Design a protein around this ligand. Structure first.
Ligand SMILES: [Mg+2]
Ligand SMILES: [Mg+2]
Lengths: 398, 397
């Protein structure tokens, strides 16, 4: 049936412990996940009139989105590609912003088909021809699409480069029947991992001004700007505070990773969010003559795209020192001591991803689990698998 | 409910399609270039009689690929890095498998032994007697046998034993077990595969050869055979095969190549031994002139940057004037940037990217689009010959 053995066979079932989970595996600690959702909601209470639209590109899993929305009291999600919107819609997550341009006719048709199915769909554009084909596909299916102009605010990825260009494209949307100009996306991904809280706030300030210049130009032209969306896990505090942005788009907040753990903040604190996402891995080789324990999770089980994964504080407990992860290639991870007990062969360990989203995308299933509380984070003892969820939006980005 | 994943339930193309019919980003295999690499390897190997090719299936994770490789090579079997790749090979009729790594989880052993019991010829590596004993135990339980090879560390410092004495003892341990058979050794140095000059590659593999020969000779002094001496890869295989010590070479990437392997200097004076047959098909979904930028839909999730950026082919330079450079645009965007009369690809246009590293990129896809261009790069004159499930894709179970 399925294209891969992995996507036909779950690594665990309801009621398993971590020792029953086939490795490498992706683990979600629901307790820490719930707490991160709780924390975001509590921070956002301080900014009323600003919506949270959690980014589904982090987890690609409909059951995750449903729980986020329930806990957040939020209405909808973001998807980067049509396939994620397809994953959300089939799992009954029906309020969607495609926070990116979609130019391929067959992908537009899939997105429009969801709006036809009853879903509330937004999509970003930066080009009139793209707007026109968006409108056409929508018209063919007897449905409508919210459309938002993407503005480049300094990330230099996609989007327009002037307030004038925003106006022109909003002007173009006005005269089309199955499309409604709904505002702007202003996302600067390059500011998300700015370490210094004052430097980060200063840089977001510039993004805020660029967004304001766009809202004001539209107002000058007699056009509305009902939604101003953007920001992420790193910057959302500053975008929410601005009075310019109406919606924030954090995705990583719920899971954290070793990159986001390094973000210093206004108070005495390094890293805003509890690590809820882990790669479970088994030690399959030990060589005490070197510094070495080799685990079964390599490149293909943990993305190194933002640096190595990290061993948690519980590892340092009852091993003595904290050993480091280096690549051993596709299917090996090297754990090296910079003397006491190395982990035994057959022993399990939890690895914090260096970067959450790409790591999640290596897996076909998410193992959702809870441990029994008052425990040091990242030990493999006393977990119970609450659920095993298909990651329906996994793939290269259709 | 077909698959855990929409992508693993829905093929990106069908038989007869041109590349413009292929949903992006996609993994394309040029069968013409693939056959030529398989033809070339075979030709070289004809110069080294007695040495068998066991191509590494971890490169492609696809049964239909292994099947074509073995027929083109006249070879008998493949390597698998994890049991999942072995399952995927065995369900697709590839019946002679070496697990070129250690397997310690009992549930994984049962799967592997399951294949042997179903009729597959299975070999597996080890470095520990306790692991050897579980291998034997599971094999006995299903009424089957396993070939077992002692892995030796020969410079890579990954896994394996670090002395010939260790080899002897482990072999002696296998010698007195009923459902296990000491087949010899694996001596693989992955660190030398991308050594650039053939001289340095001959000099450093020669040291690997000496370490391997020491193990064979120590075994012979102990009155035990070393039937199989397996190792080497796409970079080093010629020296391993030339040595008179190795009985088997393990190249995987050769059939596909990548931007990394393309840069290895060869004896004949050529840079890159293999033709690029493996591509990431991508679509320009955004253009910004005077940023000099065309953004493609293939990001981190479609092309691994683990060993370097993907490269545009010579056909791109021929069409647009100059060669653009790929930079990361995050998860779902690839940035193509100018290093001249400014001419960028249009929005909607299709482009082929040579992966920086072939295996991790392959493992991002659920399907392989097998195609032929009528008689480089260029997206113009292709027909899809077959769309094959990559049944071994995953974290490595
Ligand atoms: Mg991310
Ligand atoms: Mg490789």
């Amino acid at each position: 049936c399925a294209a891969t053995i992995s996507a036909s066979r779950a690594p665990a079932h309801l009621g398993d412990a971590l020792h029953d989970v086939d490795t490498p595996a992706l683990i979600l600690d629901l307790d820490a996940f719930d707490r991160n959702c709780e924390k975001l909601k509590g921070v956002m209470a301080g900014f009323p009139g600003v919506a949270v639209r959690p980014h589904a590109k982090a987890h690609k899993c409909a059951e995750v989105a449903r729980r986020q929305l329930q806990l957040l009291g939020a209405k909808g999600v973001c998807c980067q590609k049509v396939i994620e919107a397809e994953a959300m819609a089939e799992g009954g997550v029906s309020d969607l912003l495609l926070s990116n341009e979609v130019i391929a006719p067959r992908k537009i048709d899939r997105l429009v088909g969801l709006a036809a199915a009853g879903a509330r769909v937004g999509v970003c554009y930066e080009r009139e021809d793209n707007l026109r084909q968006l409108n056409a596909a929508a018209a063919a299916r007897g449905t409508h699409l919210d459309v938002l102009v993407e503005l480049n605010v300094g990330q230099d990825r996609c989007g327009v480069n002037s307030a004038d260009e925003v106006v022109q494209l909003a002007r173009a949307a006005a005269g089309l029947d199955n499309v409604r100009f709904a505002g702007i996306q202003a996302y600067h991904g390059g500011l998300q991992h700015v370490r210094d809280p004052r430097d980060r706030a200063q840089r977001v300030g510039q993004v805020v001004g660029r967004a304001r210049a766009a809202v004001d130009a539209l107002k000058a032209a007699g056009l509305p700007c009902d939604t101003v969306t953007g920001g992420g896990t790193g910057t959302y505090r500053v975008e929410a505070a601005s009075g310019v942005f109406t919606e924030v788009q954090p995705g990583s907040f719920a899971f954290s990773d070793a990159d986001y753990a390094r973000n210093l903040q206004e108070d005495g604190g390094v890293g805003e969010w509890e690590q809820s996402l882990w790669v479970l891995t088994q030690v399959m080789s030990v060589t005490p003559a070197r510094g070495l324990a080799v685990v079964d999770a390599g490149t293909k089980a943990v993305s190194l795209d933002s640096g190595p994964p990290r061993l948690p504080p519980a590892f340092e407990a009852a091993y003595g020192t904290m050993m480091e992860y280096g690549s051993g290639g596709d299917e090996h991870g090297k754990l090296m001591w910079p003397p006491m007990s190395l982990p035994e062969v057959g022993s399990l360990l939890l690895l914090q991803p260096g970067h959450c989203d790409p790591t999640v995308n290596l897996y076909d299933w998410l193992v959702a689990a809870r441990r029994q509380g008052g425990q040091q984070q990242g030990g493999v003892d006393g977990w119970r698998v609450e659920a095993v969820w298909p990651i329906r939006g996994r793939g290269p980005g259709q």
